[PDB]
């Protein structure tokens, strides 16, 4: 049975996962209580007399956000101790989440994964959700990915993690925590999907016509991206994509697995009727630079591998037609050794809309997720942020004191700089 364990780490992962699991109840008709009034087996586990519990854990060192789910509208959905809390948060410190206050809770968290793996018949992959700018997402996220790689070998991992933006970030020491999370993000995650905060601020402002959005609006259409990714396992379609289908079709190299993401039809409630949505029309909007989930410029790099997910009433003629137009557009450039460049997965389920959501009811959709050499620009500006910070050893006495050595900053920067060398040489003309 196609079925996926999803893990959410840190304060960003819970609120992303709160809107993620809000959405997953709507495709399968699950009530907030947890009782339905065979597609549900991917995310929800049938328990006894008509009770569907999620295949998820909510681990976080800070109890201030886990209890909000516990007292919120979805208290009865989750298992009482799948949601794992702690005493004190990491508080923007990779040392705390990895060495001091991460060790107590990682063993408790790994015990829940073994029991979730026993329930699932054929396990297909893991999805992580964390923020590299925070302490818990970086620190506790790194240790879990270190442990799960050893215990569960050769298992697919799809990394949905939030990066700092070049212009907007909510704290001071995001550059320190991001580069330390990078050393475990390369080796121990088979696929990493780039996500950024204020790139979706631009999406909400110019497409959803929301002048003053919050984090709750962002997490609902991040949820729409991941739900479009996993929609092929749950629902029947013309061309299906698995979790293992993504990896041997998108990443060519072990050290290159970071990739962008775009959800193309984004219209507010009052813009639904007057707009026309053709298959090639939205696919044109998928490759637009302003409609990407991160602040990359794909014109600077080259689309080195690409993928497409379609939902709803999309014929396989129009996907083959629209790919043909994108390939011969001069603005979008491919790497020279990738003649074919796409994966097309068409699902026959239209995208469900959250009641009270910002998105309107759309018949057809795109989830464009592509690997490009332009992602080195994200790792470059973030490395300059660490460069101008580490120059005079600022905010280092925190990291030295509770566990980490000084020399592991050297390894994290060197591994990041070697990654930048790889993105430049692979996209080079041969």
């Amino acid at each position: 049975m196609r079925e996926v364990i999803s893990i959410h780490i840190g304060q960003a992962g819970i609120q992303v996962g709160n809107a993620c699991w809000e959405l997953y109840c709507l495709e399968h008709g699950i009530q907030p209580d947890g009782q339905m009034p065979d597609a549900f087996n991917t995310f929800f586990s049938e328990t006894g007399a008509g009770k569907h519990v999620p295949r998820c854990i909510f681990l976080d060192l800070e109890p201030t956000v886990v209890d909000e789910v516990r007292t919120g509208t979805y208290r009865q959905l989750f298992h009482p101790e799948q949601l794992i809390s702690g005493k004190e948060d990491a508080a923007n410190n990779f040392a705390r989440g990895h060495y001091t206050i991460g060790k107590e809770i990682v063993d408790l968290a790994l015990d829940r994964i073994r029991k979730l793996a026993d329930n699932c018949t054929g396990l297909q992959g893991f999805l992580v959700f964390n923020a590299v700018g925070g302490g818990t997402g970086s620190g506790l996220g790194s240790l879990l990915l270190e442990r799960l790689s050893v215990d569960y070998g050769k298992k697919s991992k799809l990394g949905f993690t939030v990066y700092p933006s070049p212009q907007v970030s909510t704290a001071v020491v995001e550059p320190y925590n991001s580069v330390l999370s990078t050393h475990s993000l390369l080796e121990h995650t088979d696929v990493a999907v780039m996500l950024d905060n204020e790139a979706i601020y631009d999406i909400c402002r110019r497409s959803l016509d929301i002048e003053r959005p919050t984090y709750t609006n962002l997490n609902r259409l991040i949820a729409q991206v991941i739900s479009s990714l996993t929609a092929s396992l749950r629902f029947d379609g013309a061309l299906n994509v698995d979790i293992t289908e993504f990896q041997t079709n998108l990443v060519p190299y072990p050290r290159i697995h970071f990739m962008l993401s775009s959800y193309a039809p984004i219209i507010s409630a009052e813009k639904a009727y007057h707009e026309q949505l053709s298959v090639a029309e939205i696919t044109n909007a998928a490759f637009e630079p302003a409609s990407m989930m991160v602040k990359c410029d794909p014109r600077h790099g080259k689309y080195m591998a690409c993928c497409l997910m379609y939902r709803g009433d999309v014929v396989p003629k129009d996907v083959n037609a629209s790919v043909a137009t994108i390939k011969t557009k001069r603005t979008i450039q491919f790497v020279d050794w990738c003649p074919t460049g796409f994966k097309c997965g068409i699902n026959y389920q239209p995208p469900t809309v959250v009641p009270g959501g910002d998105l309107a009811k759309v018949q057809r959709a795109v989830c464009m997720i592509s690997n490009s050499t332009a992602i080195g620009e994200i790792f470059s500006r973030l490395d300059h942020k660490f460069d101008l910070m580490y120059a005079k050893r600022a905010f280092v006495h925190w990291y030295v004191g509770e566990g980490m050595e000084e020399g592991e900053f050297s390894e994290a920067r060197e591994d990041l700089a070697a990654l930048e060398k790889d993105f430049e040489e692979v996209g080079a003309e041969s």
Binding site: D383, D387, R413
Partner: peptide, 19 residues
């Protein structure tokens, strides 16, 4: 970028001096 890379090279080469 070049300055910080050679600074880390200097630091790890100065680790060799200590032994």
């Amino acid at each position: 970028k070049e300055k910080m890379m050679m600074s880390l090279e200097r630091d790890k080469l100065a680790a060799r001096v200590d032994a």
